[PDB]
Amino acid sequence: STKNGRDSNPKMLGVKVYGGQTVTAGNIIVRQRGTEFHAGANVGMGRDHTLFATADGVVKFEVKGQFGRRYVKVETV
Amino acid sequence: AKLKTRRGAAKRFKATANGFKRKQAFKRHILTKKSAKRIRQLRGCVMVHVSDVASVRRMCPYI
Amino acid sequence: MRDKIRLVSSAGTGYFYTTTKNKRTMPEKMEIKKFDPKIRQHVIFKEAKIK
RNA sequence: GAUGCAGUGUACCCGCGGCUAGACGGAAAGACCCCGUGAACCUUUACUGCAGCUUGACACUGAACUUUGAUUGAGGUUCUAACUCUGUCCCGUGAUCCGGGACGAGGACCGUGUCUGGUGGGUAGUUUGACUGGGGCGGUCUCCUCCUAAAGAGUAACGGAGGAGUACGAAGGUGCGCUCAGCGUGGUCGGAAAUCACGCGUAGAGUAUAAAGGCAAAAGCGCGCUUAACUGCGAGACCCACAAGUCGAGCAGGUACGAAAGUAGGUCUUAGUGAUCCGGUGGUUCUGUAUGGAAGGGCCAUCGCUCAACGGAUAAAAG
RNA sequence: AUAGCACUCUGCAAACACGAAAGUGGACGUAUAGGGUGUGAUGCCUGCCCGGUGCUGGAAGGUUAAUUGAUGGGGUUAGCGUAAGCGAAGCUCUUGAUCGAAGCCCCAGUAAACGGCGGCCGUAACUAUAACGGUCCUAAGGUAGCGAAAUUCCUUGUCGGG
RNA sequence: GAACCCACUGUCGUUGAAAAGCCAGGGGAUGACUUGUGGAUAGGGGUGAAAGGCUAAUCAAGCCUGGUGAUAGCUGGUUCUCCCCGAAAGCUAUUUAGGUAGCGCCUCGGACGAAUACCAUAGGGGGUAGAGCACUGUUUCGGCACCGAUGCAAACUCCGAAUACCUAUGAGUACUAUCCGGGAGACAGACUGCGGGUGCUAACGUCCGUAGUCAAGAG
RNA sequence: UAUAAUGGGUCAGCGACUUAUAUUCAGUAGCGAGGUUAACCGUAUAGGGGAGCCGUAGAGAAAUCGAGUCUUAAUAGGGCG
Ligand SMILES: [Mg+2]
Ligand SMILES: [Mg+2]
Ligand SMILES: [Mg+2]
Ligand SMILES: [Mg+2]
Ligand SMILES: [Mg+2]
Ligand SMILES: [Mg+2]
Ligand SMILES: [Mg+2]
Ligand SMILES: [Mg+2]
Ligand SMILES: [Mg+2]
Ligand SMILES: [Mg+2]
Ligand SMILES: [Mg+2]
Ligand SMILES: [Mg+2]
Ligand SMILES: [Mg+2]
Ligand SMILES: [Mg+2]
Ligand SMILES: [Mg+2]
Ligand SMILES: [Mg+2]
Ligand SMILES: [Mg+2]
Ligand SMILES: [Mg+2]
Ligand SMILES: [Mg+2]
Ligand SMILES: [Mg+2]
Ligand SMILES: [Mg+2]
Ligand SMILES: [Mg+2]
Ligand SMILES: [Mg+2]
Ligand SMILES: [Mg+2]
Ligand SMILES: [Mg+2]
Ligand SMILES: [Mg+2]
Ligand SMILES: [Mg+2]
Ligand SMILES: [Mg+2]
Ligand SMILES: [Mg+2]
Ligand SMILES: [Mg+2]
Ligand SMILES: [Mg+2]
Ligand SMILES: [Mg+2]
Ligand SMILES: [Mg+2]
Ligand SMILES: [Mg+2]
Ligand SMILES: [Mg+2]
Ligand SMILES: [Mg+2]
Ligand SMILES: [Mg+2]
Ligand SMILES: [Mg+2]
Ligand SMILES: [Mg+2]
Ligand SMILES: [Mg+2]
Ligand SMILES: [Mg+2]
Asked: Which Gene3D superfamilies is this protein grouped with (chain A)?
């Protein structure tokens, strides 16, 4: 017989809102197993590292800092 | 002959103004391991889903 | 083996939480401070058998 | 696997006697194989009933002596009157049935009715999973991680590789504080390797556990104090056939740590799980069949399933 | 199937069978007879094992039914209490102290009862033999007799006869 | 060894003379023998010198009439005409796999409208094709674990497209999208091209993704 | 599927989506914040019969309130309206 034959159910991770899109407060922006992206202004991080908007506005992606981390933020008006 | 109600469904569903209400499952036992959020959010009534409303109406002709 | 136990309020309200412990590492009856919604104060809860 | 399709070859029309190479010739909705939550009969230490057999209590069931226990019971010895005789003699009678009378032998036994424990393929009704390069044997059935997977999500095979059915009142919260590993030098037993001091390169260390994604404001490592491992919620969003699952700012009550701004609704995250029914425990301003109560029920919080064939056909089943 | 042989049951209103009962066969018979079971004239004969299941005989220790009902707890009110509450007696819901046989657990016998009569090492090499010696187990580890057989896979085993 | 009772071999016959026979041979034939007449045993019962044999050409439970028109997720059949639109063979679950249910896909009515699509500009995050050793593995030759040259990788990555995908504006061309209700069918697919697993870089093989055709479409 | 897969030798006649009750949705008719009778009586399709049913109000398990109700300590928030 075969010792193999097992696999886990899908998790559906990924980016849900892209740059330039309008988001109201509370929308999930990124579903990530680790902090491949970091939260900037008006963005909160959850226990499972999910990024969500804490304000109304427009999404934006950027790269900044000494370490070169990828950041995602929300710009208001 | 007169249509007969399915009493099991009648004991699970009650009519609302524009639909039906029901209780939520997973609150009978095995409660210690569950989180407080789940415990408080599974309490109370909710509405019946549209994909089930037809079956509920067919089973309960008079409610 | 972690056994289920219930922590009962000392105010007589009847309120109780539930949790588990390791009997061997914690032989003594557990005693903690927690919030009591019936009286809306913090009081001592003591271990009681989960039954 | 071709009289009937394509291309070609041959062949004037119709009988009679022979022959069986083909018309996947006729005959019987294949007996082999598989399937249907089909049937029948047979077996058993498969499940569940019943007959039969057997144990004791009560009733038919009575009377006298006598011993031993704490007015009453349990044993022994006698008796006749209930009751038994498919034993003898008389009568109905002309009869090896039956009934009545007498005698004899037994006798509170045996036997029967109700209840009750045991035994019970002798009979009776049933069950005995699915997927599978046919079926059987073997393996698998739920969850987590990687690759197949074609740079959003999702994506199959009895495809290639590993884990889970836990742990922790601290391994949780907070304030403050600190950084791994491997090397080169010299030093008591001390030596590849354990302890001390200085130096060059520098995240390979570590993160309770499998892997992946992460980790300097360290998510890694200590100390002091503590219980936010709270209660009532909840704008909004993800994922979804349903039932479910996931993240979450912010608002009230009380609380811990900070000088303060503040952080805290368990643990770096993703596995460590089980619906409904029926019952148990504690509360309860609900209901409670004439009335007042009470039983019973409802609501809130909790407990009992390796229902692993893991959306679980029964409380209960092999060949 | 059979005559022969063996085991076992049955004391007569027999065991056993039919039948719901009454009754009927067994039998107008009776242990030299009747039923069940296995084997199969006759000759020589029929080894070992009671651990398992069955059957037979013991023991009254543990366990256990109906039945019985000792206690304990609750409901309800007469009466008490400013109130909260307490509450006799009568009914009533619940608990189960004690007593309580067969069977089983236990001990012996029984195989012409159902049944069983072995492994691994050194050697045997011509497949794998307690052949023979060691040891491990078991209730025990095949006496006589026979054997490539209605039983032998290798197999058309080897040798001789025809 | 005749009658009588049987049924061991062979030919014939087998739409037969015959729903079991004829012909030539064969066995018993004073016995556990053959046979006439009249009786007894009735279906989970009977009877059986035992073959599951026989019980009216019927037997692993006879026949007849009733329950009864039993049930069959199975096979078959389903009858006049014209017009309009027009599928699927997928996901999830199932003692479930050739059944069924929710969703996806079809049709009809109502409500609503350009809120929808194609293309152009603008903003986005990738880790595949390719490529390469900076990590993890593996690999060849030299100089003293390292250094100089050299290779490879679905479960390696210092890099990294084209395409796809999500958003906002805009010209034209399309009664497009969305919501509420009535009725379904379907959940056996096949071949070809491209990217792949499996197989032998075999199969008119098998399992996925993505387009076209058949299915349901003639010339 | 020409299939060498199934069915039919031929003709005539017969042969398969029905009936009752309940419910829901569309057409059409009466009436309209109302609509409508059932059994029954009745020289009987008439006329009587208003018991009853649907609609007009929800929320909550229920007691209970009511254009509001449920939860909560909350006049906050939220669910059904
Ligand atoms: Mg409960
Ligand atoms: Mg010629
Ligand atoms: Mg001819
Ligand atoms: Mg011929
Ligand atoms: Mg033909
Ligand atoms: Mg034929
Ligand atoms: Mg057939
Ligand atoms: Mg067969
Ligand atoms: Mg039945
Ligand atoms: Mg199968
Ligand atoms: Mg196979
Ligand atoms: Mg992928
Ligand atoms: Mg992907
Ligand atoms: Mg792609
Ligand atoms: Mg049940
Ligand atoms: Mg009352
Ligand atoms: Mg399942
Ligand atoms: Mg014999
Ligand atoms: Mg002999
Ligand atoms: Mg004759
Ligand atoms: Mg004969
Ligand atoms: Mg003779
Ligand atoms: Mg009989
Ligand atoms: Mg016959
Ligand atoms: Mg039968
Ligand atoms: Mg068309
Ligand atoms: Mg298709
Ligand atoms: Mg099931
Ligand atoms: Mg089928
Ligand atoms: Mg089909
Ligand atoms: Mg490549
Ligand atoms: Mg299917
Ligand atoms: Mg399919
Ligand atoms: Mg396909
Ligand atoms: Mg194919
Ligand atoms: Mg064509
Ligand atoms: Mg064709
Ligand atoms: Mg044909
Ligand atoms: Mg067919
Ligand atoms: Mg035909
Ligand atoms: Mg005709």
From this structure: 2.40.50.100
